[PDB]
Design an enzyme around this catalytic site. Sequence first.
Site, PDB file in Angstrom:
ATOM      1  CG  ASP A  87      -2.186   0.912   0.942  1.00 15.29           C
ATOM      2  OD1 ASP A  87      -3.090   1.010   1.810  1.00 15.29           O
ATOM      3  OD2 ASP A  87      -2.273   1.604  -0.085  1.00 15.29           O
ATOM      4  CG  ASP A 106      -5.861  -5.143   2.059  1.00 11.85           C
ATOM      5  OD1 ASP A 106      -6.375  -4.349   1.235  1.00 11.85           O
ATOM      6  OD2 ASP A 106      -5.564  -4.793   3.225  1.00 11.85           O
ATOM      7  CB  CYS A 111     -11.302 -25.902   8.789  1.00 12.73           C
ATOM      8  SG  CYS A 111      -9.781 -24.986   8.458  1.00 12.73           S
ATOM      9  CB  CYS A 117      -6.224 -25.206   8.456  1.00 18.57           C
ATOM     10  SG  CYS A 117      -6.586 -24.988  10.196  1.00 18.57           S
ATOM     11  CB  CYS A 166      -9.125 -27.776  11.828  1.00 16.36           C
ATOM     12  SG  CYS A 166      -9.711 -26.106  12.194  1.00 16.36           S
ATOM     13  CG  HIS A 202      -8.908 -21.762  11.987  1.00 15.00           C
ATOM     14  ND1 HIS A 202      -9.426 -22.834  11.287  1.00 15.00           N
ATOM     15  CD2 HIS A 202      -9.934 -20.921  12.183  1.00 15.00           C
ATOM     16  CE1 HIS A 202     -10.718 -22.605  11.088  1.00 15.00           C
ATOM     17  NE2 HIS A 202     -11.062 -21.417  11.629  1.00 15.00           N
TER      18      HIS A 202
HETATM   19  N1  LIG Z   1      -4.245   3.500  -0.105  1.00 17.97           N
HETATM   20  C1  LIG Z   1      -5.451   3.214   0.472  1.00 17.97           C
HETATM   21  N2  LIG Z   1      -5.513   2.318   1.412  1.00 17.97           N
HETATM   22  C2  LIG Z   1      -6.758   2.030   2.030  1.00 17.97           C
HETATM   23  C3  LIG Z   1      -6.823   1.057   3.063  1.00 17.97           C
HETATM   24  C4  LIG Z   1      -5.715   0.109   3.473  1.00 17.97           C
HETATM   25  C5  LIG Z   1      -5.784  -1.334   2.918  1.00 17.97           C
HETATM   26  N3  LIG Z   1      -5.035  -2.231   3.815  1.00 17.97           N
HETATM   27  C6  LIG Z   1      -3.600  -1.915   3.810  1.00 17.97           C
HETATM   28  C7  LIG Z   1      -2.814  -2.751   4.845  1.00 17.97           C
HETATM   29  C8  LIG Z   1      -1.331  -2.342   4.817  1.00 17.97           C
HETATM   30  C9  LIG Z   1      -0.813  -2.648   6.206  1.00 17.97           C
HETATM   31  C10 LIG Z   1      -1.996  -2.346   7.129  1.00 17.97           C
HETATM   32  C11 LIG Z   1      -3.249  -2.428   6.275  1.00 17.97           C
HETATM   33  C12 LIG Z   1      -8.104   0.833   3.604  1.00 17.97           C
HETATM   34  N4  LIG Z   1      -8.536  -0.011   4.603  1.00 17.97           N
HETATM   35  C13 LIG Z   1      -9.892   0.194   4.731  1.00 17.97           C
HETATM   36  N5  LIG Z   1     -10.668  -0.473   5.625  1.00 17.97           N
HETATM   37  C14 LIG Z   1     -10.055  -1.105   6.780  1.00 17.97           C
HETATM   38  C15 LIG Z   1     -11.092  -1.273   7.890  1.00 17.97           C
HETATM   39  C16 LIG Z   1     -10.600  -2.278   8.912  1.00 17.97           C
HETATM   40  C17 LIG Z   1      -9.888  -1.866  10.033  1.00 17.97           C
HETATM   41  C18 LIG Z   1      -9.445  -2.803  10.959  1.00 17.97           C
HETATM   42  C19 LIG Z   1      -9.714  -4.154  10.763  1.00 17.97           C
HETATM   43  C20 LIG Z   1     -10.425  -4.566   9.642  1.00 17.97           C
HETATM   44  C21 LIG Z   1     -10.868  -3.627   8.717  1.00 17.97           C
HETATM   45  N6  LIG Z   1     -10.330   1.097   3.890  1.00 17.97           N
HETATM   46  C22 LIG Z   1      -9.235   1.509   3.179  1.00 17.97           C
HETATM   47  C23 LIG Z   1      -9.167   2.461   2.156  1.00 17.97           C
HETATM   48  C24 LIG Z   1      -7.911   2.704   1.596  1.00 17.97           C
HETATM   49  C25 LIG Z   1      -7.805   3.708   0.532  1.00 17.97           C
HETATM   50  O1  LIG Z   1      -8.763   4.342   0.100  1.00 17.97           O
HETATM   51  N7  LIG Z   1      -6.535   3.916   0.020  1.00 17.97           N
HETATM   52 ZN   LIG Z   2      -8.849 -24.780  10.554  1.00 19.34          ZN
END
Ligand SMILES: Nc1nc2c(CCNCC3CCCC3)c3[nH]c(NCCc4ccccc4)nc3cc2c(=O)[nH]1
Ligand SMILES: [Zn+2]
Lengths: 354, 354
Positions: free
Chosen positions: B90, B252, B290, B292, B295, B321
Amino acid sequence: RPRFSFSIAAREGKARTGTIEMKRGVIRTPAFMPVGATVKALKPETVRATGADIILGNTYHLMLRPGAERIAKLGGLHSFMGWDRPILTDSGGYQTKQSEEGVTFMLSPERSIEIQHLLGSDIVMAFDECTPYPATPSRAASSMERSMRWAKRSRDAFDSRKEQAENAALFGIQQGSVFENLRQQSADALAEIGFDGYAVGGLAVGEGQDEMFRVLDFSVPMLPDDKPHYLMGVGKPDDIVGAVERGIDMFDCVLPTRSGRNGQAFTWDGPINIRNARFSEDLKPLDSECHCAVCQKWSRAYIHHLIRAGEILGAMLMTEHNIAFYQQLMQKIRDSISEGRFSQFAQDFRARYF
Amino acid sequence: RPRFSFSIAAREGKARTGTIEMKRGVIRTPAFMPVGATVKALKPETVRATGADIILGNTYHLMLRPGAERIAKLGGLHSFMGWDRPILTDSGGYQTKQSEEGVTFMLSPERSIEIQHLLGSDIVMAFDECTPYPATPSRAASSMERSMRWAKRSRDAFDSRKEQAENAALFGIQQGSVFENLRQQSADALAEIGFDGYAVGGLAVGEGQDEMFRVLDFSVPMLPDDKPHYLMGVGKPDDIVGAVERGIDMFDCVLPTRSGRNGQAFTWDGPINIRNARFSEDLKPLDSECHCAVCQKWSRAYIHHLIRAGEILGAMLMTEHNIAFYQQLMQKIRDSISEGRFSQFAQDFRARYF
Ligand SMILES: Nc1nc2c(CCNCC3CCCC3)c3[nH]c(NCCc4ccccc4)nc3cc2c(=O)[nH]1
Ligand SMILES: [Zn+2]
Ligand SMILES: Nc1nc2c(CCNCC3CCCC3)c3[nH]c(NCCc4ccccc4)nc3cc2c(=O)[nH]1
Ligand SMILES: [Zn+2]
């Protein structure tokens, strides 16, 4: 395999190498036993791949959580944690209201042996008192004598449980602090009762290596020659080499695991602290010679990064390496005794390690 | 393999299944990308065994520690962490003083693309602004327009670096908040610049599934059909199924990893919290179906014990898991699209999951 058979294949001075055969597997001696209902940060298959033949579990911690009875309900410690080889359990005697009955925290000789049964231990330790250091002669004697009475109660509890007596082994624990005559009295008492193996207890309690070694010098010869000798809670690689030179066959220590998590890696050139800035761009493996999977795949630089970052993988990798190191040390010891060159190995080891 | 080739093998409605071929390997789509310079508590071989084809790294965190330049010095992210397959990075655009130049925390489009180069990223994300939710139309527009200007700067930075342009791919990120006309303007801008793939940014920022789905309904068709569509930061298993029904190819999320460490396990019958007392003597695996390794070998009871005890192995097992679950979900999706039965799979999944 039999319930228990110890065979000495080779000797060099006081040092011995051989095998302990038990129903769940063979133990090569001198042996290092990683300590756990988990060896911290490692799957059991990983523990096994490092070369461990046996691991240690603990009456005290397991009895608290998840509970001895609960583990038995679930099938025993082996099935619970996924380790199908031998397990040695300590009695709780190291780790409150004390009385002749036992200790309230209740734990007595009888309860300790029952808990180890419930866990499904292969090697059961008698319930003892680990005498504080330093101790006066009077206190050391009183403590030793109690432990010998508890040793007899342990023996009788184990023997009155047919399943346990037919499938597990029982080790006695010598006490007596640093005093030769109390160590002799204790050895005599334990031999009179009769055990499958004999531990040297009450050391690695703050006395220092020179004193520990002096006590081993006279204490190990007091124990039956034809049975394994277990030094509880030892130790650093150099403690291990010196102790084998004095007749010890078995070891457990939390150091390789604890150290690993705190950033200390064992190497043939001595311990290193991987968090030190000097390793930040070091592409070499933890140790130059080590055959473990960590040293095959990752650099000091990466593990440095992981530990400084607080990442779990850092703990995993450091712990796998250190336990592998300990097993490689044990293998070199076994091989050198079998080939009649252990005294030379010991000297070589020390010159490079230090 | 080529630098980048996306091929669609089968479709069902808006859903697609296929492959992305890159120099370091093939990516099966729809794809779930575990997030890392480590996927928390897992060795890379373990990540790979769960079925992951690609993992995500982060411009922001890596640039802080250990440093982008340091990782390049050491050979790049792949060699550093021991993952030889594709890595998506990212841009730092989600995770301060803002200006048209970039953001001071300095990070600009140019620096972001350079850092991803230094890391050795295979799939590079343009540097964007993730528009806060809720946002007024005015602010969403201003933010989107800036991101489109930064998208052009990202493209030009990537292209001016020959090694990067010849060996890596570049994805653009659509913004526009929840507004159809801004999403269209953004899609148009990005298609005019031209990218190897197109992410839908600015969602999973607190709007809720129904709104997210409504926005995907009109936004994904705006993107080039013949290129992959990546929904950033999503999500729960049900988010994933609904998003694939709307045309998304790549995902992701930190949930499977984070959840895992906190005691939440994904199952086909919905998430469970393994710390709940109801699992303390439950000998069944986390999930009944599952495949994995967790499990296959350990019970709910044991993992319950480990997580309540704070043991690292608990984090390891829960995370393996959950990532395996996510990959099995992706495989079922791929197979059902290829066999023309994904709509039925989606409905079946939901009825059991909920
Ligand atoms: N460049 C960019 N990155 C975004 C990200 C990061 C995606 N994961 C990157 C990884 C790189 C390392 C860390 C993340 C996002 N993550 C989320 N939702 C996460 C919500 C969430 C929070 C906690 C737990 C689960 C879901 N919306 C996002 C929108 C954008 C965006 O517009 N532009
Ligand atoms: Zn499992
Ligand atoms: N029954 C009994 N146990 C002893 C123990 C525990 C051995 N490890 C058990 C495992 C079961 C689970 C936990 C331990 C000892 N450990 C030590 N030294 C440890 C010193 C040390 C401390 C920290 C790091 C390294 C070394 N001396 C010990 C003496 C005795 C003893 O007489 N009787
Ligand atoms: Zn190693």
